């Protein structure tokens, strides 16, 4: 089996997004009235950190963004050079409905619009080197529904 | 030179399937955060890969239920992986 | 147990 | 009794991402299909599992042009998967 | 690592729907005017039908569908009982577009509303075993680029 | 080659 390259150390950037703060979407945007603020989150930016710092990544994390400041850092990611990187990660906590992820502003951002920075034809030093996005949202306010399967 | 298409070599490890809920215990973390970092941490100093990673979050993550609400989980990866992926501890 |  | 989602167990194999087309050789079949079950063929007997099988299928897509148009193609699966999916050949 | 059970003798159904037909849409849909027959995709239908035959499913073809025909074929396989069949597969040759497949007359078939047939509790008696899907269709107009990356 |  072919294999990804994967010696650098270190190994490459893992970004972390981690939004709490929801009061300006609440403030802001109609529907959003009682959207709530994500209490616990620092916990997985924290597990996020222990986890990719061991795997010998370089952690970046940045707490409560809004959707510009969210296109604000990709940005900042996309331009940089990481030619003596193996892999980028990108994790996002945050709210979110199908499709996308909110800021804190309650303004969204199709996940789409997010990975589509890190093309190899976006960011050329990247070519040909995994790019792994983690999101931790809703999809929607539906509760998935369980079914009954015998124990393993 | 040798070309592949622009869209190559990502993962997306979604929390949930698309129109549905995720879960966040306020004193622990996400359900999918914390299953996902837990797999990694035993499994990559075996020298799993992460699709093999991520199948095990799927199922971790399908036991957990929501009391309350009679809800469910189900994580949902994607990809344009064209090799195994592996994160060496070493 | 909360939902995002 | 015991519980799983109800969108668990999901393997779904796309020929392409979004947005794109994929590619249909008349006189031989499609790049995806005829990639897919040579790979099948080649490995189910070897006890490789699915996405392992399905991550070659996109390193061979990918290796594939058209030089009409400049074009490539990127296959793309998803998957609710809580186990390893194998095919026996017996 | 845990494995779906795979012991069946037949596996399950292996359906296939191959869509090469598609003077409907022509006729019927505006911007589907000079939407093309798809010339060679019984090369498909025969490859899968050859594979899947030598794993041990049992192959169900089903030529030059539109979407209402689409749904109906899959309306008899979520309410048929597979509490025999270890697994169950379905493949669909078709144009398409944007999270869409195409019937031979140019109706559009959300692919989740193809898949969602087949839920654990739509079809109960393939709850907790696999669900394979091969889409063969365009997802869009676009020809995906290329970049340049060093050779294995 | 043709698209689909």
């Known amino acids: ?152 | ?90 | 147990i909360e939902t995002x």
């Open chain 1, 1 to 152: 089996d072919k294999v990804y390259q994967m010696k650098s150390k270190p190994r490459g950037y893992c970004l972390i997004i981690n939004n709490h703060n929801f009061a300006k979407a609440r403030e802001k945007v109609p529907k959003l009235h009682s959207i709530r603020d994500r209490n616990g989150t620092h916990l997985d930016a924290g597990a996020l950190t222990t986890t990719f710092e061991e795997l010998h990544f370089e952690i970046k994390p940045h707490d409560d963004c809004t959707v510009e400041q969210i296109y604000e850092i990709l940005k900042i990611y996309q331009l940089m050079d990481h030619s003596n990187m193996d892999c980028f990660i990108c994790c996002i906590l945050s709210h979110g409905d199908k499709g996308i992820i909110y800021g804190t502003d309650g303004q969204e951002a199709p996940i789409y619009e997010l990975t589509s920075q890190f093309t190899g034809l976006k960011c050329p030093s990247l070519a040909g080197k995994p790019k792994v996005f983690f999101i931790q949202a809703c999809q929607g306010d539906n509760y998935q529904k369980g079914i009954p399967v015998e124990t393993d």
């Open chain 2, 1 to 90: 030179t040798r070309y592949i298409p622009d869209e190559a070599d990502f993962l997306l490890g979604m929390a949930t399937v698309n129109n549905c809920v995720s879960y966040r215990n306020p004193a622990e973390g996400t359900w999918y955060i914390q299953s996902l970092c837990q797999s990694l941490r035993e499994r990559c100093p075996r020298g799993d890969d992460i699709l093999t990673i991520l199948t095990e979050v799927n199922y971790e993550v399908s036991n957990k239920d929501d009391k309350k609400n009679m809800g469910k989980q189900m994580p949902q990866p994607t990809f344009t992986l064209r090799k195994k992926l592996v994160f060496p501890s070493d």
